[PDB]
């Protein structure tokens, strides 16, 4: 009874069932150990600052199909990665199941310079959209890409696949059929000082690279036309051209 | 009490007072003899087909400040122009004062190849938007450019200025601050078989070439960012890239 997608959650996830929470809807990958996609819905009631971060194994998954906190030991030192959120904590932690934002189904080993740099700056602008009086929702889908060998977490024996990049698809209010939208894609090795505005892409590129269909409930004609056209939502997020 | 603009009618027109009708809001130019801009609001209830075209002098204007039917005598033979509508007849002819769509304040001498070609095909797609279940309004502003000498109507003694080009700025539903938008600009000499999708521009370009501020009630930051960025509404009208 919770719809975190509005226009249909993505198809093409490796799991036929998705986890549905107030914080987000997520589709796990038991092979990579990370979520294929995470969909969430920011409203005026969802942001909450200063929450704590008790990393925890997601109790709704089989423990063999996801990571545990122990699996991150030594990762920062060896790989210069953080425990990076997919659905962002500060944008969503006002919901009733907020601690699930720190479940490791919502985390990947994300390069620190990306997590703390352009990815964070994009999160900040994404969240700020909800402060506009005429913006009542931000609906986002985010996830990883696996396109090159990224090495392995040193602290685990579990088979897993570290992402090589991350993507984020955003629209406001009711539907990208009528409302502004955006899509971004960042390599893991994006420089710390990068401008997130330089990473705009089409939804079609993300779909072709991921094997997903985003906004899967839209009419075919809407999908074809809008997914090959970069959106204008980034212009409201401080981007030029 | 009638709001044909939603987000503020344009500023900068030569007349300090505009004519407000159910069919449109119009700002006349007593020097050129044509409207500086015409703003209108298509809904599911506004289109009507097959209405006739009884051209008439606008009774709300001083006759010296506008054209009369006699003024068009011989114009097609001299200049290959038609009596071209600014606010489109078929999209608006169901309104309560529809005959005002054929008042000459809503008409200019528009090259036949443009009127019957790309301009008409844009009108058709603009009108078709309202058939979509999720589109409840189309708000448009249209008007001329005055940049080169296009000749004089042979049938009048009045000083007048034939337009050199025509533009159309469109958005759907509530506001371009949140909804898709488009802008188009066509020279008078546009070839008959031209594809209207090849004439997309920014709102900023139209403003700079007219002295107007369109959507003048939007916040400054919304104006600055969106007006320099071509919109995505044309993708819903059959256009690509
Ligand atoms: Mg982060
Ligand atoms: Mg016409």
UniProtKB/Swiss-Prot annotation, chains A, B:
Any single Pfam family the record assigns to this protein: Endonuclease_NS
Cofactor: Mg(2+)
GO cellular component, one term: extracellular region
Annotated effect of mutating residue 83 to A: Reduced activity 1000-fold
Membrane-spanning segments: none
Recorded coiled-coil stretches: none
InterPro entries (alphabetical): DNA/RNA_endonuclease_AS, DNA/RNA_non-sp_Endonuclease_sf, Endo_G_ENPP1-like_dom, ENPP1-3/EXOG-like_nuc-like, His-Me_finger_sf, Non-specific_endonuclease
SUPFAM superfamilies: His-Me finger endonucleases
Keywords on record: Disulfide bond, Endonuclease, Hydrolase, Magnesium, Metal-binding, Nuclease, Secreted, Signal
Annotated compartments: Secreted
Variant or mutagenesis effect after changing residue 115 to Q: Reduced activity 1000-fold
Note on how the cofactor is bound: Binds 1 Mg(2+) ion.
Catalytic activity of the protein: Endonucleolytic cleavage to 5'-phosphomononucleotide and 5'-phosphooligonucleotide end-products
Catalytic residues, chain numbering: 85
Additional note from the record: The active site contains 1 hydrated magnesium ion that has only 1 direct interaction with the protein; all other interactions are via water molecules.
Similarity-based family: Belongs to the DNA/RNA non-specific endonuclease family.
Oligomer and partners: Homodimer.
Role: Catalyzes the hydrolysis of both DNA and RNA, double- or single-stranded, at the 3'position of the phosphodiester bond to produce 5'-phosphorylated mono-, di-, tri- and tetranucleotides. DNA is a slightly better substrate than RNA.
PANTHER family linked to this entry: ENDONUCLEASE G, MITOCHONDRIAL, ENDONUCLEASE RELATED
Protein name: Nuclease
Organism: Serratia marcescens
Highest classification ranks of the organism: Bacteria, Pseudomonadati, Pseudomonadota, Gammaproteobacteria, Enterobacterales
Gene: nucA
């Amino acid at each position: 009874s919770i719809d975190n997608c509005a226009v249909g959650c993505p198809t093409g996830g490796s799991s036929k069932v998705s986890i549905v929470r107030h914080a987000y809807t997520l589709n796990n990958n038991s092979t990579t150990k990370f979520a294929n996609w995470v969909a969430y819905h920011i409203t005026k009631d969802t942001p909450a600052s200063g929450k704590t971060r008790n990393w925890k194994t997601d109790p709704a998954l089989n423990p063999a199909d996801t990571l545990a906190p122990a699996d991150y030991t030594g990762a920062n030192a060896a790989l210069k990665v953080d425990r990076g959120h997919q659905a962002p904590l500060a944008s969503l932690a006002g919901v009733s199941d907020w601690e699930s934002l720190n479940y490791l189904s919502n985390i990947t080993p994300q390069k620190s310079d990306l997590n703390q740099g352009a990815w964070a700056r994009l999160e900040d602008q994404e969240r700020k959209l909800i402060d506009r009086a005429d913006i009542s929702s931000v609906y986002t889908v985010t996830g990883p890409l696996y396109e090159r060998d990224m090495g392995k977490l040193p602290g685990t024996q579990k088979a897993h696949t570290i992402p090589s990049a991350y993507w984020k698809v955003i629209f406001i209010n009711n539907s990208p059929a009528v409302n502004h939208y955006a899509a971004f894609l960042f390599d893991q090795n994006t420089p710390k000082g990068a401008d997130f505005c330089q990473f705009r892409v089409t939804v079609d590129e993300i779909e072709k690279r991921t094997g997903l269909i985003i906004w899967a409930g839209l009419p075919d004609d809407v999908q074809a036309s809008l997914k090959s056209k970069p959106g204008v939502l980034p212009e409201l997020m401080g981007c030029k051209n």
